[PDB]
Design a protein around this nucleic acid. Structure first.
Ligand SMILES: [Mg+2]
Ligand SMILES: [Mg+2]
Ligand SMILES: [Mg+2]
Ligand SMILES: [Mg+2]
Ligand SMILES: [Mg+2]
Ligand SMILES: [Mg+2]
Ligand SMILES: [Mg+2]
Ligand SMILES: [Mg+2]
Ligand SMILES: [Mg+2]
Ligand SMILES: [Mg+2]
Ligand SMILES: [Mg+2]
Ligand SMILES: [Mg+2]
Ligand SMILES: [Mg+2]
Ligand SMILES: [Mg+2]
Ligand SMILES: [Mg+2]
Ligand SMILES: [Mg+2]
Ligand SMILES: [Mg+2]
Ligand SMILES: [Mg+2]
Ligand SMILES: [Mg+2]
Ligand SMILES: [Mg+2]
Ligand SMILES: [Mg+2]
Ligand SMILES: [Mg+2]
Ligand SMILES: [Mg+2]
Lengths: 138, 118, 81, 119, 160, 177
RNA sequence: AGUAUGAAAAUGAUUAUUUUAUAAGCAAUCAUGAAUAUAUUAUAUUAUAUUAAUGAUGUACCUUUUGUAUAAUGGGUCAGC
RNA sequence: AGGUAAAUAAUCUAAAGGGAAACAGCCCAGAUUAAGAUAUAAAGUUCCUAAUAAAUAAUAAGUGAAAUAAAUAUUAAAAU
RNA sequence: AAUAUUUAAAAUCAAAUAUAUAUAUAUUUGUUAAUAGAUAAUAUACGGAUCUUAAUAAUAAGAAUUAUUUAAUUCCUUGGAAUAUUAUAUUUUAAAAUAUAAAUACUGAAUAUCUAAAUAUUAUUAUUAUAAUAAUAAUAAUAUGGUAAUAGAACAUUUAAUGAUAAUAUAUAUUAGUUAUUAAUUAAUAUAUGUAUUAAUUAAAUAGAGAA
């Protein structure tokens, strides 16, 4: 007799159709506040339009608040990066925005040496066994 | 090169090399390159070229590299990112000056989308 | 399943053995139908190994995935015990 | 002698092989220097590089130091050298008037092929 | 990907026989060979953090080879801590006390890595001066090997 | 042997007996370009792999049947039988008629303590399993047996119960694959 | 030595999680099992956090000196100055 | 004399890293931050401990195996 | 065999290299070992285990010491060629024949390269807006250990000048994220306050404490 075990599938984003990780970016600035100058300049100066043209899968919100200028991204996995861009020039802000768009949303993490590939798949060759080895031990 | 058993097999692995760094992969595997890719943006597809070994459970084709005609191996660039920020401190043994060696290396997450014998 | 198909009766046999009279032995048993092995089964006990060989055989029966080049494989239903 | 400079009086096999290799490398360097000069002189006279390389009559170096290095009586090759002169310096204050080359400071860089005739 | 699968067999503690009467190695070389096995360096699944080494049953240890005059010269030391209590025993004396298996064990102990798992590794070594031993029945065996062995001997072993 | 590829061990440049875990040696080992036969150093228990499935379970129109990869390394003549029923060693017998069965059933209901399964088997030259299949006992007897089992279970310590639970979990795990 | 407020620390007791009764040294770092907790995208074969299995490396800090793990100087801890 | 006085070079001083069991000054080599595929230095490759296989001689003393102890004696071995 | 020296490649011979060259000349290399002598006080002390080989009998061990060497062995001129070896496959009758491969010994640093990131300078670009400029980004090169010391650039804190805003806010604390991160920012939670001498630029300082 055979019975099922209820189990769910694991989504591999890349393999079938690539859904782009960055979904939304919020440009936040202040009209007062000298720290928000470079952000304000960026918003003004035709760069944002170009960016939006380049990346039509990201939505680009533009908000005004009293505090420091902010770049909060929003990713497919549900995580949210928020970069404060206080006192940065236009070009630095743009670089920060580029960095954000590049990111897959996942948390930052220490990797050990050669911790390269991350598989869900069972090994193509088996796992080693001392009884089934080619050269028997002594 | 009679590549028939490899072609037949349902499971199949590759050992492609990026800058002589080997990465053993199947389809769906998620490679994490320890550097910033400049050529490819996120979403771009990489056709792997320096493929050393292509293996089934009991057979393996090997080349230096293997003929590009014999196989396919498409990775997708699924996010440039970084390692966690670390600050190890550097100092000598009777010296109050303690230089902070800040570090936050770059990563590029690839995903092996296609891997098959052509 | 063996009865249903044109196969000889399956019997389990010890292939290899080590650590009998220990906390954690290893018994390799193979379920043979004739000279052909159907399932390979490792285990701490003999019974366990036998069970595992049978389960392996059943997995191989069911999870058989044919090639796209093959003509369509319509199975003959589930093995009603 | 309370401080312990634990340096053995003789070399290991692996050390000796490395020393030999180093000696061979300096001879090779010298050979390359002479060869390049010869090639240059052939070119000046008016031959191609390949022709110069082929040439039966190889030109000997005119500068003094190079010419001395070429001479085996002054600067012997590793294959020419004695077993003893590869692994033992002359040290007048030692017993046997001899000392391991590994005991010489910076022996890995510093060259010393020729010992005195009877020491 | 390579690591994913059933690992139970890889980490299985096998039992390795060594008939010292047959083996032509000297004592120390044999001990060194054993040490690796005990550690688990022979197996590719090995990691320094995990003890994953096999059992080694040594048998007919009375016929162990020792070169030179070490059997009557080589001295094994011991000391409690109280001064004037250095206990020095020659190899032959040690053998007389315990056996050739004790001697082998000491060698194997010295070969092993000095940490919390060392004792465990040493325990896994099972040495016997003569032939007869309880672990006879648990040495790794295969069905293809059975034709080599005569019929009644196997039965006698099983009975034992 | 369909394919005549050269066969290779999973080769290190270092001493494999001393440094099997050292990946660096494996990485170093280059071998000449072409096709090879690396037989797997693994049991084929969990594998759904096509090189692992036997030929009888492959379909008739499968190209893989002809190829030599489900290797018959073992031999059934050499291997001895494990936990094999007496029917499998000396064949199944279908000798007992309806009357005999009816008699057995009558006996079992009447007195399962006297006429137990094993006794019935001995009498009629048949299996205890078959006796069970044929005939139910008196439900009272079953109830008594259940009560006895419960009493035994109660008589356990905490530790024993836990061990039994663990054993049960292990058993369940065996049949997963 | 004003008045309010006060999850500032040192410090004590208690509870929870986790490790610990065959193991030896600045008590950390890196590797690496396991256990627990949290997680309105754990879809999971998930992620973070906590925790002296086990392995490796690791001679407090300052001062003063040719030179200090030094059994040379100085510091019981934390808060304010 | 791990002494003292100066001469030349190097290192330490102010230099972390590998080796020399442990090591300010010896043998290699100079840490901007990572990564870890390839060349390597000095030093190593039975196990502890990362890495090895050979050849030709000699030793039998555990000599020796990373800190070489002398005159002299005995026993051999070659050459004259 | 005996007596007596020497322990040597200077001579001598042999072998190899270089100049005219089947020879001459010049240069380079090759000449013992063991034991005893032997030796103190917490405890054996090559760093420790241990290392010296053995037919029958192994798909298998045989210095892990000393000396001279090699990277399978032999000729020719790093290289090729031949030779057997080892492993594998194929064909034939556990052997023979054919062929493919391995011969680049390996480990090893925070050395060098590659792979990316940062700053500085030199030389070329690109983009965006002393434009012979500035910011950002490319490429090639060089440089980036540091006590005493010199020089350059920042940040936290407190006050003064200027100064939007607001309980959907601000401040402080805790926890978890984010930005190459002494700092600030996001979210949640807590307590205060109808509110920053707030962002920013200047001016200044009782302006930063494990060392008295
Ligand atoms: Mg310090
Ligand atoms: Mg100092
Ligand atoms: Mg314990
Ligand atoms: Mg210790
Ligand atoms: Mg010191
Ligand atoms: Mg002190
Ligand atoms: Mg003390
Ligand atoms: Mg004090
Ligand atoms: Mg000073
Ligand atoms: Mg200097
Ligand atoms: Mg140092
Ligand atoms: Mg530097
Ligand atoms: Mg090793
Ligand atoms: Mg000794
Ligand atoms: Mg000594
Ligand atoms: Mg002469
Ligand atoms: Mg002593
Ligand atoms: Mg040593
Ligand atoms: Mg470097
Ligand atoms: Mg500096
Ligand atoms: Mg102050
Ligand atoms: Mg304070
Ligand atoms: Mg401080």
């Amino acid at each position: 007799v055979v019975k099922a075990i209820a189990r769910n599938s694991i989504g591999r984003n890349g393999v079938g159709a690539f859904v782009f990780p960055c979904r939304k970016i919020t440009l936040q600035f202040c009209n007062w506040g000298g720290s928000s100058e470079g952000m304000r300049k960026f918003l003004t100066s035709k760069r944002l339009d170009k960016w939006g043209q380049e990346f039509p899968w990201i939505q680009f919100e533009v908000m005004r608040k009293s505090g420091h200028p902010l770049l909060r991204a929003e990713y497919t996995n549900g995580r949210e990066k928020v970069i404060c861009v206080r006192n940065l020039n236009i070009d630095n802000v743009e670089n920060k925005l580029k960095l954000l768009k590049d990111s897959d949303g996942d948390i930052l993490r220490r990797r050990t040496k050669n911790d390269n590939v991350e598989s869900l798949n069972s090994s193509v060759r088996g796992i080693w066994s001392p009884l089934h080895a080619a050269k028997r031990h002594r | 090169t009679d590549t028939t058993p490899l072609k037949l097999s349902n499971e199949l692995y590759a050992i492609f090399k990026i800058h002589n760094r080997p990465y053993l992969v199947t389809e769906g595997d998620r490679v994490i390159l320890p550097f910033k890719l400049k050529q490819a943006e996120v979403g771009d597809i990489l056709n792997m070229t320096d493929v050393t070994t292509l293996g089934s459970r009991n057979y393996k084709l090997v080349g230096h590299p293997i003929n590009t005609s014999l196989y396919t191996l498409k990775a997708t660039v699924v996010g440039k990112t970084k390692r966690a920020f670390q600050t190890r401190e550097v100092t000598k043994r009777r010296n109050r000056r303690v230089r902070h060696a800040k570090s936050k290396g770059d990563l590029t997450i690839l995903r092996i989308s296609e891997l098959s014998m052509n | 399943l063996c009865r249903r198909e044109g196969l000889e009766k399956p019997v389990s046999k010890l292939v290899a053995e080590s650590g009998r009279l220990s906390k954690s032995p290893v018994f390799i048993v193979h379920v043979f139908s004739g000279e052909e092995t159907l399932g390979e089964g490792y285990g701490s006990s003999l019974k366990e190994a036998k069970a595992r060989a049978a389960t392996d055989a059943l997995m191989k029966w069911y999870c058989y995935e044919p090639l796209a080049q093959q003509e369509p494989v319509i199975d003959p239903g589930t093995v009603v015990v | 002698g309370g401080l312990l400079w634990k340096i053995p009086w003789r070399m290991s096999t692996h050390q000796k092989t490395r020393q030999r290799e180093r000696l061979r490398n300096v001879d090779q360097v010298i050979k390359q220097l002479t060869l390049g000069l010869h090639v240059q002189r052939c070119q000046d006279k008016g031959l191609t590089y390949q022709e110069a390389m082929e040439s039966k009559k190889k030109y000997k170096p005119r500068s003094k130091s190079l010419r001395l290095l070429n001479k085996p009586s002054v600067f012997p090759k590793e294959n020419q050298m004695s077993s003893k002169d590869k692994y033992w310096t002359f040290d007048k204050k030692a017993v046997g008037y001899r000392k391991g080359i590994h005991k010489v400071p910076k022996w890995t860089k510093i060259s010393i092929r020729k010992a005195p005739k009877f020491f | 990907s390579q690591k994913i699968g059933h690992s139970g067999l890889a980490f299985a503690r096998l039992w390795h026989h060594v008939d010292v009467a047959r083996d032509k190695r000297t004592l120390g070389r044999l001990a060194s060979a054993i040490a690796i096995t005990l550690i688990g360096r022979h197996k590719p699944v090995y990691h320094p953090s995990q003890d994953c080494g096999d059992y080694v049953v040594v048998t007919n240890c009375q016929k162990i080879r020792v070169t030179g005059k070490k059997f009557e010269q080589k001295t094994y030391w011991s000391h409690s801590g109280r001064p004037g209590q250095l206990k020095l025993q020659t190899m032959n004396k040690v053998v007389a006390d315990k056996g050739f298996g004790e001697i082998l064990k000491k060698a194997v102990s010295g070969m092993l890595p000095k940490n919390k798992l060392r004792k465990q590794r040493l325990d896994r070594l099972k040495v016997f001066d003569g032939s007869e031993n309880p672990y006879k029945q648990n040495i790794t065996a295969f069905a293809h090997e059975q034709s080599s062995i005569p019929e009644p001997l196997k039965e006698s072993i099983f009975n034992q | 042997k369909q394919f005549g590829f050269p066969k290779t061990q999973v080769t290190t440049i270092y001493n494999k007996t001393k440094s099997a875990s050292n990946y660096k040696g494996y990485l170093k080992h280059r071998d000449a370009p072409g096709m090879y036969y690396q037989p797997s150093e693994s049991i084929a228990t969990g594998s759904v792999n096509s090189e692992t499935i036997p030929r009888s379970f492959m379909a008739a129109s499968d190209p893989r049947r002809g190829l030599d990869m489900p290797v018959q390394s073992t031999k059934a003549k050499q291997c001895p039988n494990v936990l094999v029923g007496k029917s499998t060693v000396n064949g199944k017998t279908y000798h007992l008629g309806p009357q005999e069965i009816d008699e057995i059933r009558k006996l079992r209901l009447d007195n399962p303590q006297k006429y137990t399964r094993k006794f019935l088997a001995a009498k009629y030259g048949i299996s205890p399993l078959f006796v069970s299949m044929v005939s139910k006992p008196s439900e009272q007897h079953v109830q008594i047996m259940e009560s006895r089992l419960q009493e035994i279970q109660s008589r356990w310590k905490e530790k024993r119960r836990i061990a039994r639970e663990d054993r049960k979990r292990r058993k369940l795990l065996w049949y997963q694959a």
